[PDB]
């Protein structure tokens, strides 16, 4: 029966009878839902959304995605490889220009929050929706999702900031620091020290190759600091990482005492790190 329903549906799609295809699919889906045949509903709605999107019918496609997500909630669909896979497949067909692209993405992230152990959403899903958001010109949301994503997301996050920096045709220390500091602060906030170090390295490596600033590498006990002669803010930011790692109040205080200005510019961030790593209220 379901196979027959999908066959008739696809036939209407091919004939260009979008309205009828849409109307009939929802009616049948409604029936499955009333019967509590959620798996049947999910398969029908999911394939329907995909068909409309591939046919460039964004309106009907996203409409069914919202329907899919509501049933995911109703059916208490747990976040896992299979449930996420359906969404990832739909995202691949979403035109970054869809008027309601953002709402579709929010719905997907919200479901992954509600039915997973992740307070801010599934990291794997984040890697996918983050790139879609960037394509749709939602840069701050892309950043947030990449920050809360996977290792591949960390690489994409560095590319985002790197490409953005190269966009502004400005290499003043204060400007380069506006980009670099986001990698340092965000990864420190979620305590992913390994990501902080890797992103830091990629970003600085690229900055060096591109602009060839005056610098000298300082290596001690397995740690390295790229001392820039004309980018003191970058020096300070690199030292922040190691300092939080020590969780030593004295070093934190010593670092800030030496970089008074930067400590004022990043006052709010440092206050948070103060409580997070040094237990300073």
């Amino acid at each position: 029966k379901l196979a027959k329903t999908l066959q008739r549906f696809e036939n209407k799609i091919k004939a260009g009878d979008y309205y009828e295809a849409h109307q009939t699919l929802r009616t049948i889906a409604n029936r499955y839902v009333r019967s509590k045949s959620y798996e049947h509903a999910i398969e029908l709605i999911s394939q329907g959304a995909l068909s409309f999107l591939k046919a460039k019918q964004g309106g009907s496609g996203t409409d069914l995605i919202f329907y899919l997500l509501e049933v995911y909630d109703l059916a208490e669909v747990k976040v896992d490889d299979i449930s996420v896979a359906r969404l990832v497949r739909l995202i691949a067909e979403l035109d970054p220009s869809e008027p309601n692209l953002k709402d579709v993405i929010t719905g997907m992230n919200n479901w992954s929050i509600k039915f997973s152990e992740y307070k801010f959403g599934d990291p794997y899903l984040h890697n996918t929706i983050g790139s879609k958001l960037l394509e749709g010109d939602f840069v701050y949301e892309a950043e947030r999702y990449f920050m809360l994503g996977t290792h591949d997301s960390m690489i994409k996050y560095v590319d985002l900031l790197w490409d953005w920096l190269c966009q502004v045709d400005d290499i003043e220390d204060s400007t380069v620091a506006e980009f670099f500091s986001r990698l340092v602060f965000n990864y420190l906030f979620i305590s992913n020290i390994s990501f902080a170090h890797e992103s830091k390295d990629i970003f600085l490596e690229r900055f060096i190759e591109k602009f060839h600033p005056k610098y000298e590498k300082i290596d001690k006990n397995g740690y390295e600091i790229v001392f820039f002669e004309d980018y003191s803010d970058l020096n300070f930011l690199q030292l922040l990482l190691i300092t939080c790692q020590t969780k030593d109040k004295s070093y934190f205080l010593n670092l800030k005492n030496h970089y008074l200005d930067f400590s004022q510019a990043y006052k709010s961030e440092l206050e948070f790190l103060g409580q997070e790593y040094f237990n300073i209220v």
Partner: protein, 48 residues
């Protein structure tokens, strides 16, 4: 000049003993409950 001396000495002392948190440290993402404080916007718009 003097900054180089400070950075070098600071790093030497900050790593004299192995830091409480190693470089490979990663708090399980499922255990993160606070994202910190909102960072300021970049002073430029993004060009897609």
């Amino acid at each position: 000049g003097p900054e180089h001396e400070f950075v070098s000495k600071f790093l030497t002392l900050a790593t004299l003993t192995e830091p409480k948190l190693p470089k490979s440290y990663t708090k399980p993402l499922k255990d993160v409950t606070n994202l910190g404080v909102p960072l300021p916007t970049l002073k430029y718009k993004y060009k897609q």
